[PDB]
Design a protein around this ligand. Structure first.
Ligand code: BCL
Ligand code: BCL
Ligand SMILES: CC[C@H]1c2cc3[nH]c4c(c3C)C(=O)[C@H](C(=O)OC)c4c3nc(cc4[nH]c(cc(n2)[C@@H]1C)c(C(C)=O)c4C)[C@@H](C)[C@@H]3CCC(=O)OC/C=C(\C)CCC[C@H](C)CCC[C@H](C)CCCC(C)C
Ligand SMILES: CC[C@H]1c2cc3[nH]c4c(c3C)C(=O)[C@H](C(=O)OC)c4c3nc(cc4[nH]c(cc(n2)[C@@H]1C)c(C(C)=O)c4C)[C@@H](C)[C@@H]3CCC(=O)OC/C=C(\C)CCC[C@H](C)CCC[C@H](C)CCCC(C)C
Ligand SMILES: COC1=C(OC)C(=O)C(C/C=C(/C)CC/C=C(\C)CC/C=C(/C)CC/C=C(\C)CC/C=C(/C)CC/C=C(\C)CC/C=C(\C)CC/C=C(\C)CC/C=C(\C)CCC=C(C)C)=C(C)C1=O
Ligand SMILES: CCCCCCCC/C=C\CCCCCCCC(=O)O[C@H](COC(=O)CCCCCCCCCCCCCCCCC)COP(=O)(O)OC[C@@H](O)CO
Ligand SMILES: COC(C)(C)C(=O)/C=C/C(C)=C/C=C/C(C)=C/C=C/C(C)=C/C=C/C=C(C)/C=C/C=C(\C)CC/C=C(\C)CCC=C(C)C
Ligand SMILES: COC(C)(C)C(=O)/C=C/C(C)=C/C=C/C(C)=C/C=C/C(C)=C/C=C/C=C(C)/C=C/C=C(\C)CC/C=C(\C)CCC=C(C)C
Ligand SMILES: COC(C)(C)C(=O)/C=C/C(C)=C/C=C/C(C)=C/C=C/C(C)=C/C=C/C=C(C)/C=C/C=C(\C)CC/C=C(\C)CCC=C(C)C
Ligand SMILES: COC(C)(C)C(=O)/C=C/C(C)=C/C=C/C(C)=C/C=C/C(C)=C/C=C/C=C(C)/C=C/C=C(\C)CC/C=C(\C)CCC=C(C)C
Ligand SMILES: COC(C)(C)C(=O)/C=C/C(C)=C/C=C/C(C)=C/C=C/C(C)=C/C=C\C=C(C)\C=C\C=C(/C)CC/C=C(\C)CCC=C(C)C
Ligand SMILES: CCCCCCCCCCCCO[C@@H]1O[C@H](CO)[C@@H](O[C@H]2O[C@H](CO)[C@@H](O)[C@H](O)[C@H]2O)[C@H](O)[C@H]1O
Ligand SMILES: [Fe+3]
Lengths: 325, 274, 50, 52, 256, 44, 51, 44, 51, 51, 44, 44, 51, 43
């Protein structure tokens, strides 16, 4: 069959590319060591590039490790420093938020006090990383779209653990730091406040989350479909469009009646991705604070479906019939 | 109408089963043999939905609910107002979706471009197919498909999700979700990269691929490249669609018990010193 | 003694930025630890006294 | 490739063998599969690095 | 907060409608930003179409092109338009496909159609040409996969036309963009380029299924053997994909 | 003789003196703050 | 006396924006912990004063 | 002669003098504010 | 024994000192947290225990 | 003996960091194992000894 | 002779003397810290 | 002779001589620590 | 008697790294499985002996 | 003949000290197992 551009059939490696650099002079804080990996080269660039050791990045890395360690040692102290039990219960242990009977006041260390300390360091690391993205775009004389797209993720991140607990009157509304526990919190949050399916902003965020995956399957396949026309070089197609941009546009113009440009595709791509946590952040922020039961909110706003059938298994079958006896 | 460059690409040929009989454009849309069947199936399915809405008693888009038959009906056809209409719309939906994918094959064949998009859509079709015709057959009843309602099919997901006792512990759902979050994460970063390079601060030259390539090298220490991101992104989205198909096809006909109890293999191993 | 040579090894710009952030985070952290305990929570003691 | 693909094929065969090898001496399919998957990652990666 | 104003319209409803207004503005902004290329609309006769859609064209934005390539304003006067297209309409109306007057692949009208890009090679950050033969590359070499250099080239119909002489690499991003084909005297003369995304490399031979043996002699050439301009780059890539529909009647005619 | 930063020995000597003056001042107020807390509510 | 040399190595523009943001956040953050404390919540205390 | 930020010695001397005037002004208001609130409701 | 000064001929002072500084503080924080976890060595709580 | 020839193979600056992280990780792991056992948990023994 | 970091023997001896002086001073504080901590509720 | 990292034969001999002294010193403290903790709570 | 020429095909630095990892992993694994059984668990035997 | 760029002159020397290390590693392992066997025999 025709060669699908999923895996490169041959890859070349030359001298390592350090960077472009300018009078902003990013070289001093840039690492001098790079590596090459052929396994990752079958699908992308094979060069493991050099970190830029900025102060926002270093602070984020140091404080992020502090949050990671604090949660880790509390987890290790959960099972009494038993490593085999710690590994076995790794997906189950967590650093639980403070008990609800403490409010915004600082709770004792064993009852969420270490959660606040870990959360504070996590907040510093996450914000510092965002400042790194903003500074890196500024030093590269590029757009701040990476920083703004990241800031959208910060919005839901801040709402989940900082903004909502502050104006909910208790630190207990924060998300536990656990693999399964934050899944338990995710389910319990929906159950406590009705049903987040019936939260319009949760539904809106789901619309953009499906759309984000939908677009990036559309965009990923369309570019790979026009990669025979140099469609992977999107930036040069923006400045001087070739048959790759035209065919990609006409594929979707002939399919769904309208298309995008090689640059306008990423504006569509950016916004649904950015809108996914923005809408979710709004929905969580006003969940409980404003609406304490989403299904009842749906009932009074007339978008909760009504079912006229019976709700019992005895109305459709019988216990003996189900067992086959 | 036509774009400023569309005239040349509008050439005859590149059809699968149709010929010059259906080889024409209606507005911007391209009609083919499968565009004829898409138009028939989509209109028939859409009209039957509103016909069912009329008999349901409400035309509210939120409250419209066409539901599959009872589980007592098994795999056989049900009365139209008792679930049979849902089966026909499902048949129309499968025909509309398959024809749409086959039409996209005709679009890309005429343009000389690859068949990546119809293949990528087929993965999303497979996710719908496994939800409405594959899972019901493995259970022996058409009543396990989701109802055709804006909010009714949200109740089905909620009920099916809790029908397996905290669906969050489903290992395939765990894999499927992290593909959904990564795809949106990848979409945001990739969309930001191109826009940032193409739209610098005022008075600054536009940035080429080298400037955007080194940004993540200075950001996360590795950049997958202009070509790499599109293929990894397509696989990230296709895996999300594929693993979503897996997480629901293994729910009923594979693991009838609760999903946390699936993790009992990890909790109960000989290596662990109980 | 003669620890002044540390500036021949450490960049004055780098060490002070790290020191400034490190001291504040170690000043906010400890303050929260006393705020955690009921014995050293000066806010609660004022309420208890009054 | 070639050598790396073959080395991966040896690992998945070994992973399948360990999946059923531990099932014979007890365990369960899921417990055996994890060891089989773990074996495939370890010996498959080691063979793909050392042999090739 | 917990109390409602004028009915059941609470703060959650107010936020929902505020987003609805913002989204409508966003869709207008997003849709307009995609109208910078290919607009205004036209009909099959080339005249301006009576209908331009519900979205007006946006304000002119400017791109400060690098390496001293001037500025660029997208909305208006697309310089990439091709003037003499070898096509004529199969119908007096609109919405019907064009039939090429002469050779579709030589004229480049259908899938073989290219775009009138700049006649200059693409440049990296250094200002050097972006795509260069690996012979001119400083320290580049094959790191993994099958090296196609020296492998015979097999066309779509199975004919052997020549062996690969070199691969045109992208030193800026470190990947192969082309393969140089040294045509045998029977099947043509000189060297021609085939993009890596259209070629399939096997263990012993390298094959392209899009173009038959007789069409390699007509593959567009490059003015210089050391660099390829965007115009030649677009012509070369389009020609191979044009053969997916024009190599023989069996590809153009219905498959069922 | 060795200076990775580049500043000379004399420059290091004066910078350390200022840093120590700041460090002792920061420490001195810290000790007084630590001392005054001990009379308030001792932790030993 | 000689602390003025801190500006020879710190950029005044970079420090001041960090100083201004840090000063307000610290001022705000301290004001919230007072509100959380029932003894120092001057808002709810006025209601208690009014009896 | 150790200007890491490209700012000469004389400019730094006046920069700090004005900055301290702002710092003392900020601290003086804070001291009065702290003194006022301690009389209103002491925390010690 | 006394030739330990040659460790600087292998390790540059800048990188080892930065690694040493982070390691010592993390070690100090790790140990302090451990004692704070134990009820016997939690100096904060036993202060409350003494009236 | 003649074990000094290992440095003709191993890079001193890459193996010193290798054992440096290994020795501490080994030391930390064994300390954690001792803390897990109630017999050797010197922190809990101090609490038990005080009674 | 065997200078992996461009640092001569004389610098190494000078720098190690400072490092050991700082090390012993840091260890001396820790010893007094541990000795006082052992007097007040020992762990043995 | 064999040199995969440089370090002519003389250089490697002196590197191991001080490495062995460091290893013995580290193990000597470990032996003393192990002997001390065995007297405290033996594990045999 | 002629096993010295194994290194003619095996790179020393390539096999020494693998051997060092293998020996420690094997030693830890044997120690771990030895702690799994209650007969050879020297930590529990010490606890039982002093009881 | 050779795959790692070594000759018989030093490859023999390399194995000579490797066996010395192997014997020393085994010797301390033999006494370790002998001590464990006396303490807690497993046969
Ligand atoms: C029973 C479970 C409840 C449920 C409860 C919730 C809750 C609770 C929430 C959601 C939210 C979301 N739900 Mg829901 N949801 C349910 C059912 C669903 C279903 C479905 C098919 O059934 C779907 C598709 C969704 C979909 C979604 C997404 C639309 C949305 C989160 C987007 C997101 O990623 O934000 C992106 C942001 C984040 C994930 C955090 C950003 C992380 C930060 C920025 C990164 C820090 C990194 C960290 C430091 C680690 C770094 C380590 C690195 C390795 C170095 N839900 C049911 C109703 N849902 C969210 C929402 O409401 O949005 C409005 C949310 O809070
Ligand atoms: C109580 C509920 C349980 C739960 C139970 C379920 C159940 C039950 C299901 C999922 C499924 C999914 N869950 Mg879950 N899930 C939960 C919590 C979550 C959370 C979260 C943050 O909490 C998330 C992110 C997810 C995420 C997801 C995705 C993995 C997946 C969504 C379907 C999908 O992939 O597309 C798949 C669907 C398609 C691609 C549709 C195909 C569309 C067709 C081809 C085109 C449509 C055309 C149409 C006609 C429109 C045209 C009209 C106009 C002309 C344009 N779940 C909660 C805890 N989850 C669903 C799934 O996997 O489905 C496979 C599933 O059935
Ligand atoms: C637009 C919404 C989407 C989005 C976007 C988004 N996320 C982003 C960005 C953007 C645009 C970034 O630029 C930023 C980034 O850099 O990405 C690569 C990021 C990011 N979002 C991330 C995660 C993430 N995104 C998510 C989702 C989303 N973010 C949405 C789908 C999710 C969810 C909800 O599942 C997660 C979990 C990160 C990959 C990154 C943020 C990381 C960052 O910059 O700071 C965070 C903290 C650290 C880097 C420090 C962590 C600590 C250590 C590195 C870990 C431990 C190391 C080791 C074990 C130490 C051991 C020590 C001991 C031995 C002593
Ligand atoms: C499948 C993998 C991922 C993906 C990919 C993907 N989707 C795609 C494509 C690709 C690559 C296309 O090329 C194709 C396209 O052209 O999009 C614009 C498409 C598409 N996927 C779409 C939607 C969509 N994708 C989704 C998700 C995803 N997209 C996945 C994550 C979702 C989810 C899960 O929310 C939806 C809703 C469409 C925009 C489009 C398919 C267009 C199509 O099929 O047109 C023909 C049909 C009609 C015009 C109407 C048919 C009506 C029926 C006959 C009756 C109703 C049936 C239906 C089941 C009722 C539903 C009732 C309620 C549940 C609402
Ligand atoms: C860089 O590269 C790229 C581009 O840029 C070159 C691109 O742009 C894109 C495309 C992506 C974009 C973001 C561009 C903008 C697009 C979107 C925002 C949409 C994608 C995102 C979503 C979240 C999905 C939203 C879905 C939408 C907008 C709906 C579109 C889909 C539909 C199914 C509806 C349209 C289809 C219709 C109306 C039916 C099709 C018509 C036919 C088959 C014709 C049949 C006719 C007959 C048989 C004859 C009968 C005639 C009749 C009855 C007359 C009636 C006439 C009519 C016209 C109906 C990509 C991926 C890309 O990578
Ligand atoms: C009933 C009706 C009521 C109506 C009420 C709303 C009405 C109106 C509000 C205005 C709507 C306008 C909508 C149009 C959207 C267009 C915005 C846009 O896209 O324009 C971009 C500007 O980018 C952005 O604006 C980034 C957005 C910030 C991200 C949010 C931050 C999370 C914050 C999270 C918080 C969320 C809050 C919860 C041009 O950029 P560029 O040209 O590409 O680059 C230039 C180069 O200089 C780079 O520097
Ligand atoms: C669980 O953990 C719990 C128990 C909670 C816990 O608490 C853990 C606590 C732990 C681990 C304590 C760890 C703390 C340690 C180790 C204390 C480090 C702190 C130190 C060392 C204090 C430095 C102060 C230096 C200053 C502040 C100098 C002032 C500098 C001045 C401003 C001069 C600046 C220079 C100039 C003005 C001119 C120079 C320039 C030219 C000449 C050009
Ligand atoms: C679960 O685990 C539990 C049980 C909880 C646990 O506790 C585990 C604990 C475990 C395993 C202990 C691990 C700790 C170890 C091993 C202790 C290492 C610590 C050491 C060794 C201390 C060095 C201190 C040296 C300094 C700090 C010198 C200061 C140097 C000064 C600042 C001078 C520097 C200046 C110059 C050199 C300038 C000269 C420059 C020129 C001449 C240019
Ligand atoms: C899970 O199982 C359970 C039962 C729980 C378990 O615990 C399993 C335990 C297991 C398996 C034990 C595994 C332990 C092993 C294998 C012990 C390795 C430890 C070793 C080998 C000790 C090295 C010491 C090295 C130093 C410390 C040197 C000091 C060097 C000094 C500082 C000098 C450095 C400087 C120079 C050389 C200068 C030269 C420079 C020039 C000449 C320029
Ligand atoms: C699951 O099952 C249960 C029942 C639980 C189980 O336990 C299964 C157990 C199983 C399967 C046993 C598997 C173990 C095996 C097979 C034992 C291999 C172990 C061996 C063989 C030991 C080598 C030691 C050699 C050294 C360590 C030399 C030291 C070398 C020194 C350091 C010198 C190095 C230096 C040079 C050479 C310099 C030369 C340089 C020049 C000449 C320049
Ligand atoms: C060998 O390893 C050792 C060493 C053992 C080790 O450590 C290993 C570590 C191990 C295993 C830990 C692994 C961690 C795991 C699995 C946790 C996953 C984490 C998850 C799922 C996070 C979900 C919730 C996130 C939110 C949503 C936060 C919200 C944060 C908010 C925004 C912070 C806001 C700030 C505050 C509340 C502070 C306010 C106070 C002041 C401002 C003063
Ligand atoms: C793979 C794609 C889907 C292909 C589907 C093919 C299987 C279709 C199954 C149809 C089964 C009809 O079988 C029906 O079973 C039910 C239960 C019986 O009802 C009693 C009906 O009398 C019988 O008609
Ligand atoms: Fe793209």
């Amino acid at each position: 069959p025709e060669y699908q551009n999923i895996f490169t059939q041959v890859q070349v490696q030359g001298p390592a590319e350090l960077g472009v650099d300018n009078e902003n002079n990013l070289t001093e804080e840039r690492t001098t060591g790079t590596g090459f990996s052929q396994l990752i080269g079958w699908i992308g660039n094979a060069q493991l590039g050099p970190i830029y050791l900025g102060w926002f990045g270093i602070i984020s890395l140091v404080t992020g490790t502090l949050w990671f360690n604090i949660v880790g040692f509390n987890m290790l102290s959960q099972v009494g420093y038993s490593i085999p039990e710690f590994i076995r219960q790794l997906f189950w242990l967590a650093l639980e938020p403070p008990s609800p009977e403490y409010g915004l006041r600082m709770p004792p260390l064993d009852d969420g006090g270490w959660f606040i300390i870990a959360s504070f360091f996590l907040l510093v690391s996450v914000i510092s990383w965002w400042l790194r993205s903003y500074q890196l775009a500024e030093m590269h004389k590029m757009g701040k779209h990476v920083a703004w797209a990241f800031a959208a993720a910060i919005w839901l991140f801040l709402v989940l653990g900082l903004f909502r607990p502050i104006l909910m009157g208790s630190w207990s509304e924060a998300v536990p730091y656990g693999i399964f526990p934050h899944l338990d919190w995710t389910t319990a949050f929906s159950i406590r406040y009705g049903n987040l399916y019936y939260n319009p902003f949760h539904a809106l965020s789901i619309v953009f989350l499906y759309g984000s995956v939908l677009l990036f399957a559309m965009h990923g396949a369309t570019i790979l479909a026009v990669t025979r026309f140099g469609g992977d070089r999107e930036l040069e197609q923006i400045y001087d469009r070739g048959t790759a941009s035209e065919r990609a546009g006409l594929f979707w113009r002939w399919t769904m009646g309208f298309n995008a440009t090689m640059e306008g595709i990423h504006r569509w791509a950016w916004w649904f991705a950015v809108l996914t946590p923005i809408t979710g952040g709004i929905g969580i922020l006003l969940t409980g604070t404003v609406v304490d039961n989403w299904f009842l909110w749906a009932v009074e706003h007339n978008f909760a479906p009504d079912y006229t059938q019976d709700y019992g298994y005895e109305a459709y079958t019988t216990y003996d019939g189900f067992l086959g006896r | 109408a036509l774009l400023s460059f569309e005239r040349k690409y509008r050439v005859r040929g590149g059809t699968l089963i149709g010929g010059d009989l259906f080889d024409f454009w209606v507005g911007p849309f391209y009609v083919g043999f499968f565009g004829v069947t898409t138009a028939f199936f989509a209109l028939l399915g859409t009209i039957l939905i509103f016909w069912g809405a009329s008999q349901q008693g409400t035309f509210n888009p939120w409250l419209i609910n066409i539901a599959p038959p009872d589980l007592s009906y098994g795999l056989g056809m049900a009365p139209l107002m008792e679930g049979g209409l849902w089966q026909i719309i499902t048949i129309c939906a499968i025909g509309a979706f398959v024809s749409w994918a086959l039409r996209e094959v005709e679009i890309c064949r005429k343009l000389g471009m690859g068949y990546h998009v119809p293949f990528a859509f087929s993965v999303a079709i497979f996710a719908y197919v496994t939800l409405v015709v594959f899972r019901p057959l493995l259970m022996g009843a058409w009543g396990h498909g989701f109802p055709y309602g804006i909010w009714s099919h949200l109740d089905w997901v909620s009920n099916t999700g809790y029908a397996y006792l905290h669906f969050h512990y489903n290992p395939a759902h765990m894999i499927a979700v992290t593909f959904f979050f990564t795809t949106t994460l990848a979409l945001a970063l990739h969309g930001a990269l191109v826009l940032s390079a193409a739209n610098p601060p005022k008075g600054e030259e536009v940035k080429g691929p080298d400037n955007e390539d080194t940004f993540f090298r200075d950001f996360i220490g590795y950049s997958i490249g202009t070509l790499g991101i599109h293929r990894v992104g397509l696989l990230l989205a296709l895996n999300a669609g594929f693993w979503s198909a897996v997480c629901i096809i293994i729910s009923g006909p594979v693991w009838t018990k609760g999903w946390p109890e699936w993790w009992n293999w990890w909790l109960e191993m000989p290596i662990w010193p109980s | 003694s003669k620890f002044y040579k540390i500036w021949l090894i450490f960049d004055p710009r780098r060490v002070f930025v790290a020191q400034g952030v490190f001291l504040f985070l170690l000043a906010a952290m400890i303050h929260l630890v006393l705020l955690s305990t009921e014995h050293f929570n000066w806010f609660e003691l004022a309420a208890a006294n009054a | 490739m070639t050598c790396t693909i073959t080395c991966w094929g040896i690992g998945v065969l070994l992973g399948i063998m360990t999946t059923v090898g531990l099932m014979v001496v007890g365990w369960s399919f899921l417990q055996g599969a994890f060891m089989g998957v773990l074996a495939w990652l370890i010996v498959g990666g080691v063979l793909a690095v050392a042999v090739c | 907060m917990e109390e409602t104003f004028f009915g059941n319209f609470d703060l959650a409803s107010l936020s929902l409608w505020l987003f609805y207004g913002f989204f409508a503005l966003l869709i207008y902004y997003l849709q307009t930003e995609n109208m910078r290329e290919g607009y205004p609309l036209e009909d099959d006769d080339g005249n301006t179409a009576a209908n331009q859609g519900p979205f007006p064209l946006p304000k002119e934005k400017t791109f400060k092109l690098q390496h001293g390539r001037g500025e660029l304003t997208l909305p208006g006067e697309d310089v990439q338009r091709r003037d003499n297209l070898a096509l004529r309409k199969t119908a007096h109306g609109n919405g019907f496909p064009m039939e090429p007057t002469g050779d579709p692949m030589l004229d480049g009208v259908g899938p073989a159609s290219w775009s009138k890009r700049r006649d200059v090679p693409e440049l990296d950050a250094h200002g050097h040409p972006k795509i260069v033969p690996m012979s001119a590359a400083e320290g580049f070499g094959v790191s993994a996969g099958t090296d196609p250099r020296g492998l015979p080239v097999m066309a779509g119909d199975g004919e052997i036309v020549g062996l690969v002489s070199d691969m045109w690499i992208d030193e800026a991003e470190q990947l192969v963009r082309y393969l140089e084909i040294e045509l045998d005297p029977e099947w043509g003369d000189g060297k021609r380029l085939v993009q890596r995304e259209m070629v399939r490399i096997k263990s012993d031979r390298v094959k392209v299924r899009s173009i038959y043996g007789k069409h390699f002699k007509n593959v567009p050439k490059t003015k210089s053997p050391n660099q390829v301009t965007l115009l030649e780059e677009d012509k070369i890539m389009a020609y191979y994909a044009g053969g997916t529909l024009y190599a023989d009647e069996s590809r153009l005619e219905p498959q069922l | 003789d060795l200076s990775f930063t580049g500043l000379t020995d004399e420059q290091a000597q004066e910078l350390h003196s200022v840093y120590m003056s700041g460090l002792w001042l920061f420490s001195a107020v810290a000790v007084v703050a630590h001392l005054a807390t001990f009379i308030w509510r001792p932790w030993f």
